[PDB]
Design a protein around this ligand. Structure first.
Ligand SMILES: Nc1ncnc2c1ncn2[C@@H]1O[C@H](COP(=O)(O)OP(=O)(O)OP(O)(O)=S)[C@@H](O)[C@H]1O
Ligand SMILES: [Mg+2]
Lengths: 58, 360
C-alpha cells in the first residue's frame, strides 16, 4: 500500500514474482478493499484487476 | 466432468448478480474471514437442491440477501451452475426463490425437485449423501471420533440406521419369544433375520468399499510407500453393534490405533478416512471448507500436493482455504471481498496462479 501511492495494475505489481508473492499481492487487494483503502474493478474473469484509491484515502 | 461456473443473484451475503469462477481442476476460494467464503459453498449445495434446514436458515426467504436485516433485497433470488462434461455440451442447472416457492430449471426446462435431483443424481451428485462437500471442522471432528462413534458415522451415511430400530423392536420380539407357539416363534426368527440382513447389507455396501481404499489413500497422503491404514469392525457378524477400530502405521513408526497417534498424525489418518468415505460413490467435484485449518506446518504441503494430484486425475477440487501454504498450489484463486452495508456484501475476484513460478 505504502509504495502503491492514478490507478494500479495487479498484473503489473506481479511482474516477475512467484506464486507465493503474487498470491500475496492478490490477497492484499482483498484486504485493502475491505479496509476501504481502495476500490477495484475487473472486466472479465481472469483479466487484470485495477485499483483506484478508495474512500479511506492512501 | 466439472463445475464450469456459478451464477448467483441475491443469495445470502452475495448482493446483486455475479459470476463466480469460471473454475478449473484446482481452485481455491480465499478471502478475509467472515466475508462469505462458506456462503459460496451454501450456494453450490443450494443449487444442487439442499433442504432449507441444512443451509443454516430457518425459512427459505432467509436465504435472500438482506433477510437478516428485515430488508430482503427482492422477492426473487437464484443460483445456477454450468456443468461441463467431455463429449457433451454444457448443461445449466438453476434454482430460483420466488416468494416462498423454490423453482428449478435445466436449460430453462422447468422441472420439479424430483426430476432436478435424478439428473444431478446421474452426474454423481447426491444431495442426500452430500458426497460433494466437506464442512468446516469435519476433519478434526473425525479425528476425535471413537470406534462406536465411527460405527455411528458409517450407519447414518449408509442409511443403516433407518432400519436400526425396527431391528430393535424385532430383537425385543425374539428375546421374549403348545405347538401353536413353536410356529409363531418361527415367524419371529424369520421377521428378525430379515431385518438383520437388510441392515447388515446397507452397512456393508458402504463400509466395505471405504475399507479397501483407505490404505492406498493413506499411502498417497503420506507421500511414503511405508504407510499402512486398516479399517475393520469389532463385530464382523453384526458390525452395527460394536465399534470400528482404525489402525495405522505412520511412516517410520510403529503399528498402533489411530487414537494413540500424535495430533499431526491423527489428522492425516482423519483425512485418509475422509477421502476414503468420499471414495464410496464419488462426486465429480469435491468442495472442502477450510480443511487446512487443522493442518500444521509439516503436513500442510503434503495434502496440498495430494489434492493437486487428485485434481488432474479423480475429481475437480474446489477448496476454501485460509493458509497461503495450501492455496498457492491452486491453479486459480477466487478471492472473496466484502463491501460495506447493513449486512455483509460479498463479491469475488479471479486470479490466475499458473502465470507464475513455484517457490524456491
Ligand atoms: N441472507 C443473507 N443476507 C446477507 N447476509 C447473510 C445472509 N445470510 C448469511 N449472511 C451473512 O454471511 C456472512 C458470511 O457468512 P459465511 O460465508 O459463513 O462466513 P465465512 O467467510 O465462511 O466465515 P469463517 O468460516 O468464520 S472464515 C455471515 O456473517 C452472515 O451474517
Ligand atoms: Mg466458513
Amino acid at each position: 500500500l505504502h509504495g502503491l501511492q492514478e490507478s494500479i495494475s495487479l498484473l503489473e505489481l506481479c511482474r516477475n514474482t512467484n506464486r507465493k508473492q503474487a498470491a500475496a499481492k492478490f490477497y492484499s487487494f482483498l484486504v485493502l478493499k475491505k479496509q476501504q483503502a481502495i476500490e477495484l474493478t475487473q472486466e472479465e474473469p481472469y483479466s487484470d484487476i485495477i485499483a483506484t484509491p478508495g474512500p479511506r484515502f492512501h | 466432468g466439472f463445475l464450469k461456473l456459478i451464477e448467483i443473484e441475491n443469495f445470502k451475503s452475495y448482493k446483486g448478480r455475479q459470476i463466480i469462477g469460471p473454475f478449473q481442476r484446482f481452485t481455491a476460494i480465499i478471502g478475509p474471514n467472515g466475508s462469505g467464503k462458506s456462503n459460496l459453498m451454501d450456494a453450490i449445495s443450494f443449487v444442487l437442491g439442499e433442504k432449507t434446514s441444512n443451509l443454516r436458515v430457518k425459512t427459505l426467504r432467509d436465504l435472500i440477501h438482506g433477510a437478516p436485516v428485515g430488508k430482503p433485497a427482492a422477492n426473487r433470488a437464484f443460483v445456477s451452475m454450468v456443468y461441463s462434461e467431455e463429449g457433451a455440451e454444457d448443461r445449466t442447472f438453476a434454482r430460483v426463490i420466488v416468494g416462498g416457492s423454490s423453482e428449478y430449471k435445466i436449460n430453462n426446462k422447468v422441472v420439479q425437485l424430483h426430476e432436478y435431483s435424478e439428473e444431478l443424481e446421474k452426474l454423481g451428485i447426491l444431495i442426500k449423501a452430500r458426497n460433494f462437500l466437506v464442512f468446516q471442522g469435519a476433519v478434526e471432528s473425525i479425528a476425535m471420533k471413537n470406534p462406536k462413534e465411527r460405527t455411528a458415522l458409517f450407519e447414518e451415511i449408509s442409511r443403516s440406521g433407518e432400519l436400526a430400530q425396527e431391528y430393535d423392536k424385532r430383537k425385543k420380539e425374539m428375546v421374549k419369544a403348545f405347538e401353536a407357539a413353536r410356529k409363531r416363534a418361527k415367524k419371529a426368527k424369520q421377521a428378525f433375520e430379515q431385518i438383520k440382513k437388510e441392515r447388515f447389507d446397507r452397512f456393508n455396501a458402504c463400509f466395505e468399499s471405504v475399507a479397501t481404499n483407505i490404505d492406498e489413500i493413506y499411502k498417497a497422503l503420506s507421500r511414503n510407500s511405508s504407510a499402512q491404514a486398516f479399517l475393520g469392525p469389532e463385530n464382523p457378524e453384526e458390525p452395527y453393534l460394536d465399534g470400528i477400530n482404525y489402525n495405522c502405521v505412520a511412516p517410520g513408526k510403529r503399528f498402533r490405533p489411530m487414537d494413540n497417534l500424535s495430533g499431526g498424525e491423527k489428522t492425516v489418518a482423519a483425512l485418509a478416512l475422509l477421502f476414503a468415505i468420499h471414495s464410496y460413490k464419488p462426486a465429480p467435484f469435491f468442495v472442502l471448507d477450510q480443511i487446512d485449518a487443522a493442518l500444521d506446518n509439516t503436513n500442510i504441503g503434503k495434502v496440498a500436493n495430494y489434492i493437486k494430484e487428485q485434481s488432474t486425475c479423480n475429481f475437480q477440487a474446489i477448496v476454501i482455504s485460509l493458509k497461503e501454504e495450501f492455496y498457492t498450489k491452486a491453479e486459480s484463486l477466487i478471492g472473496v471481498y466484502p463491501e460495506q452495508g447493513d449486512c455483509v456484501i460479498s463479491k469475488v475476484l479471479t486470479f490466475d496462479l499458473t502465470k507464475y513460478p513455484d517457490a524456491n
